[PDB]
Design a protein around this nucleic acid. Structure first.
Ligand SMILES: [Mg+2]
Ligand SMILES: [Mg+2]
Length: 212
DNA sequence: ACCTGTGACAAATTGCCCTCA
DNA sequence: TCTGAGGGCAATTTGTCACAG
DNA sequence: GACGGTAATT
DNA sequence: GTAATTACCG
């Protein structure tokens, strides 16, 4: 049974922009941190490859490029911004990377919490769909169902959606429908929604879900 | 002016393949 | 030989915007 | 490369 | 023929 990720709701609702590969690595960091400290973590290429059904080569490519793409990335808890890394990653041994997570991030990870097993999200491709599945997990009930109304502006400012998704039809076509379809095809969740409006503008999205 | 969706194009990402220390 | 660090790809997805209703 | 199987050399 | 350590090859 795959690793049970838990995280403070403050991270689920933080403002940041990470790729799929970066979020994948981040889940393992959160797992390492929680089992305890000082903040120094490690990643093995071959274990990553086995976890996500990747080759060693493509695993190596994903880790390396995610890792160099962390530089300058920042995290906002609503309104405080932090860098993810305080030192570049580096490899003491072949197939092994050592990373220095900002120790000031530790209390935001382990605290009003969100939890999901890693197999639920490891087939998801779109990172915004990972964000959506995390925010839905934050409201899930023991039995596996839930319902929540999210404000569109808050979705855009938390997930840092790109500017053209401020136009609602592109928001619908390239984010909402794709990430709902992905969740429904790639997780053990079954998700539906309906739109809440005010005048001509759509202001919130109401998600209902149950477990299969 | 506001809303919706679709058609196109560009930019990014994906799972691939190959090569050599 | 088995790893993994590189070097590439075509097909597909994602981000953007012009245009009609 | 890094590691271990296998022949080779004392 | 054996023993055992070793260069090196895959
Ligand atoms: Mg990859
Ligand atoms: Mg999709």
């Amino acid at each position: 049974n795959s690793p049970r990720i838990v995280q403070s709701n403050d991270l689920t609702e933080a403002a940041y922009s990470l790729s799929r590969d970066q979020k994948r690595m981040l889940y393992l960091f959160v797992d390492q941190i929680r089992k305890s400290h000082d903040g120094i973590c490690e990643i093995h290429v071959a274990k990553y490859a086995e976890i996500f059904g990747l080759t060693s080569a493509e695993a190596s490519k994903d880790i390396r490029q995610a890792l160099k793409s962390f530089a300058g990335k920042e995290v906002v808890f609503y309104y405080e911004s932090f860098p993810w890394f305080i030192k570049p990653a580096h490899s003491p041994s072949r197939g092994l990377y050592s990373v220095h997570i900002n120790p000031y991030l530790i209390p935001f990870f382990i605290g009003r919490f969100t939890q999901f097993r890693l197999s639920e999200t490891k087939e998801i491709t779109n990172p915004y769909a990972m964000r959506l599945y995390e925010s839905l997990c934050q409201y899930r009930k023991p039995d596996g169902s839930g319902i929540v109304s999210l404000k569109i502006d808050w979705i855009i400012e938390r997930y840092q959606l790109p500017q053209s998704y401020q136009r609602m039809p592109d928001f619908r076509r390239r984010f909402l429908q794709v990430c709902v379809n992905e969740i429904n095809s790639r997780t053990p969740m079954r998700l539906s929604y309906i739109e809440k409006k005010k005048g001509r503008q759509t202001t919130h999205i109401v998600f209902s879900f149950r477990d299969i």
